[model samples]
Target: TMKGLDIQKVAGTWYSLAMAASDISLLDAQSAPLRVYVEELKPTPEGDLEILLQKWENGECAQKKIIAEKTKIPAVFKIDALNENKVLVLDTDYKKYLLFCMENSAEPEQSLACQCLVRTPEVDDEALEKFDKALKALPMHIRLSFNPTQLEEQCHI
Candidate 1:
């Protein structure tokens, strides 16, 4: 967290630049666990979050939304109803970039969903480079590895 992280500023549009995961296969098929594409992370009333996203389904992008319940920590949230996973904001400038790491309660490992996102659909080379740099320094990413991959244009809504 970037010292007293504020969810108010964290809420809004963010681009999915790239992703890092324990099993890269999880990102391969839209049926895979890491195949969801986030379109907006808007704030909801009474706290928590309204996560708007497009999930790939049967050769098409499916519209969906999940409520990530806010935790005691301002920058963390539970993305599922069963409370099986907890997502934490690794770091963000709240202007140009955002970092996220989700940990599964049932599993001993984490970073299955350590994603790098930006505030725009596209950006300058410098911002892209910065995102790469920030990703390298993030400790939350699993030892599995990183991939500079995206499927947003095909599923933009």
Candidate 2:
């Protein structure tokens, strides 16, 4: 839970520092449900979040947009694209990085996922340590990956 969560601070460019998912198979590749690059988070007047992201599709980086509907509870959102999948902002520092979590709370698959995003491609030692600790806190069979220095030119489109 990111206390006093502010979408304004979350907006702008962001690069993936680290990522993990309870379902190891889902962390495999482009096909991975949670591997998309978050380009921006635009907060609408009605409080909805417009998420601009990039995904790998057919050997090319594809830019896409998704809107997460805001809930009465702060920092929690429901994404209609996944038929009401929930997303939560676990933690964040307005300046540097943020911990993002999303899950499909269905009976099976238990697709719990987390992605630590930073404003810069260069991740500091402190951020790494913090995220490592956060990941450990989650009780799941996790598969983790690090994207060293943003994937350049992979999502020009």
Candidate 3:
């Protein structure tokens, strides 16, 4: 059985420290070390969580709002906006960092994408070590894809 998560604690802002994918093509070639800002996570009338996610795509910032339904497994969600898209929380302390994974269950060809999000751009070495260990435990299909320097060279952010 998967571990349980505190929904309230999981809802907040996070910055991508690293990303990985099973199929490289699933990632946008132009975006490296993606950044995400979760504006809010609130319960809808139907008990689903409404997630307002903002991120950069191409050269512009885009927003994706989705109603996520909690599954029987804690920390797992079924995205209502997309068919067969699922989310899982691999690991998290609900404070400093989170390790999450996404995949299209309907399409086997789709790659599993995973990300390590830190509270700040400059994360402590201990937290980074934990992130590295967590990522390495993922399935072999998921391999590191984000080049931190690439983002630095392009956006200098």
Candidate 4:
């Protein structure tokens, strides 16, 4: 887990570098080169956090604000959006890319979903390799739903 994580560094724009989930088909159906913008992270007086998440879908971007609080563990958060799911900060340098995961309970089992968000679509090969390794470390049940070629082509414009 990341210690003394700074929320400010994570507040920025990011593009989907890679993603995987047990039920990844849902994401596979979506468009490629998905972009996400974290407008800010505000701490509520009640010791919780309000996060602004901007996501692109169809042909436009929409914003959703969510509140989350830290869990018993470090760098872990709980959000009501996913049934109080446990969100973890898997890896990030607050720079080029960030790798995060959220756990969800299925009808019969638990599923761990992960996504690699990068600052730029033209990310360097080294960072891409690192993201690839980090993504591959996840459980085999979660498979990649991202298509880089498609994203590259779309983001090229």
Best by TM-score: 2
Clashing pairs in 2: none
CA-lDDT, candidates in order: 0.64, 0.72, 0.59, 0.57
Measured with C-alpha atoms, the lDDT of residue 27 in candidate 4 is: 37
Q: Tens digit of lDDT per residue, candidate 2, span 48-120?
A: 7888888776676778888888898779888854322878888888578888777876632467777777777
Model 2 spans > 4 angstroms off:
82-84, 151-157
Q: What is residue 51's positional error in candidate 1, in angstroms?
A: 1.0
- Estimate the overall C-alpha local distance difference test score of candidate 3: 0.59
The 10-residue segment with the lowest total lDDT in model 1: 140-149
Candidate 3 per-residue lDDT over residues 71-151, each given as its tens digit: 777777887343337767778787787777666777634546766666655545665676668766555343442344432
How far does residue 44 in candidate 3 sit from its true spot (Å)? 6.1
TM-score of each: 0.76, 0.86, 0.69, 0.65
**What root-mean-square deviation over C-alphas does model 2 reach?**
2.6
Task: List model 1 lDDT by residue over 1-157, tens digit each.
Answer: 4458777787888767666665555565556666566678888776787877777777777777878897888877887622237777777778877777666778725335666667766643555565466556544333222223442464533
Off by over 4 Å in 3: 31-48, 80-84, 137-157
Better of 2 and 4 by TM-score: 2
